[PDB]
């Protein structure tokens, strides 16, 4: 089979929680936060780990959902984490960066990562995306640019600097299982080592650096996990 089961079953089930400003919280088991630096925004987490996401006139928005850490252990001390997530389009218009995929921080060191499989922007990031372009690689059986970079910016400990790191898959997906271990392994390969991870959320991030992007995103499945 050429798909996973849930790409063909995937719809929003369970309590759900509607934000409307930025939030940290959980619904049932699952992790949420909603960012935005601006515009009028809002996010629905539901207890399945399924989402959606809506922004208006922003400059950088941020919807995500999955797991929440204590910044205690590594990676490799938490154990191997996967997340399996269906994305589903709708209208935007605006988008001048986009990031669709796993998402989280580490401390000690502070850096922000994502694993990028699609965007809501027309195009897909480019080499923009960071100042240290390490090239093409195989991880978890596909294509990936991988990045380095170094950031100026909000952050989960204030505003400060970072560096990031970033997988960008070289053909979009819209559904999946993404193995986030695996780009943890690729990237530890090109020096680019992890810290205590902080979380690893399913993420959509939509923004543009001088107007204000607006849109909906819908994640009828969204769900991160430690194990196989
Ligand atoms: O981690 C996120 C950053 O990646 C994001 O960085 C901005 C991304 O947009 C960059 O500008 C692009 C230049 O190329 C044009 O064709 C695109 O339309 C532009 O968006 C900008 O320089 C980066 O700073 O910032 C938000 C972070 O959460
Ligand atoms: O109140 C602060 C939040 O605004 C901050 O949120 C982070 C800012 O950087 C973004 O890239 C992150 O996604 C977001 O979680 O967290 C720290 C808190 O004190």
Same mark, same amino acid.
């Given at each position: 089979?050429?798909?996973?089961?849930?790409?063909?079953?995937?719809?929003?089930?369970?309590?759900?929680?509607?934000?409307?400003?930025?939030?940290?919280?959980?619904?049932?088991?699952?992790?949420?936060?909603?960012?935005?630096?601006?515009?009028?925004?809002?996010?629905?987490?539901?207890?399945?780990?399924?989402?959606?996401?809506?922004?208006?006139?922003?400059?950088?928005?941020?919807?995500?959902?999955?797991?929440?850490?204590?910044?205690?252990?590594?990676?490799?001390?938490?154990?191997?984490?996967?997340?399996?997530?269906?994305?589903? %389009?709708?209208? !935007?218009?605006?988008?001048?960066?986009?990031?669709?995929? $796993? =998402?989280?921080? @580490? +401390?000690?060191?502070?850096?922000?990562?994502?694993?990028?499989?699609?965007?809501?922007?027309?195009?897909?990031?480019?080499?923009?995306?960071?100042?240290? %372009?390490?090239? !093409?690689?195989?991880?978890?059986?596909?294509?990936?640019? $991988? =990045?380095?970079? @170094? +950031?100026?910016?909000?952050?989960?400990?204030?505003?400060?600097?970072?560096?990031?790191?970033?997988?960008?898959?070289?053909?979009?997906?819209?559904?999946?299982?993404?193995?986030?271990?695996?780009?943890?392994?690729?990237?530890?390969?090109?020096?680019?080592?992890?810290?205590?991870?902080?979380?690893?959320?399913?993420?959509?991030?939509?923004?543009?650096?001088?107007?204000?992007?607006?849109?909906?995103?819908?994640?009828?499945?969204?769900?991160?996990?430690?194990?196989?």
């Amino acid at each position: 089979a050429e798909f996973q089961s849930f790409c063909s079953s995937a719809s929003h089930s369970g309590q759900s929680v509607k934000v409307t400003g930025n939030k940290v919280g959980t619904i049932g088991g699952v992790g949420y936060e909603l960012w935005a630096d601006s515009g009028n925004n809002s996010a629905t987490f539901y207890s399945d780990g399924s989402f959606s996401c809506t922004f208006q006139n922003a400059g950088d928005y941020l919807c995500r959902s999955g797991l929440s850490f204590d910044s205690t252990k590594t990676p490799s001390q938490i154990g191997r984490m996967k997340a399996d997530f269906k994305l589903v %389009k709708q209208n !935007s218009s605006n988008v001048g960066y986009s990031y669709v995929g $796993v =998402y989280g921080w @580490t +401390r000690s060191p502070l850096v922000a990562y994502y694993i990028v499989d699609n965007w809501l922007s027309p195009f897909p990031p480019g080499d923009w995306v960071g100042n240290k %372009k390490h090239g !093409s690689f195989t991880i978890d059986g596909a294509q990936y640019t $991988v =990045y380095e970079n @170094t +950031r100026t910016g909000p952050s989960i400990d204030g505003d400060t600097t970072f560096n990031q790191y970033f997988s960008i898959r070289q053909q979009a997906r819209d559904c999946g299982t993404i193995d986030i271990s695996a780009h943890f392994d690729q990237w530890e390969k090109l020096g680019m080592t992890m810290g205590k991870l902080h979380e690893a959320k399913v993420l959509g991030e939509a923004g543009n650096v001088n107007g204000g992007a607006s849109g909906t995103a819908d994640f009828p499945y969204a769900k991160v996990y430690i194990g196989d």
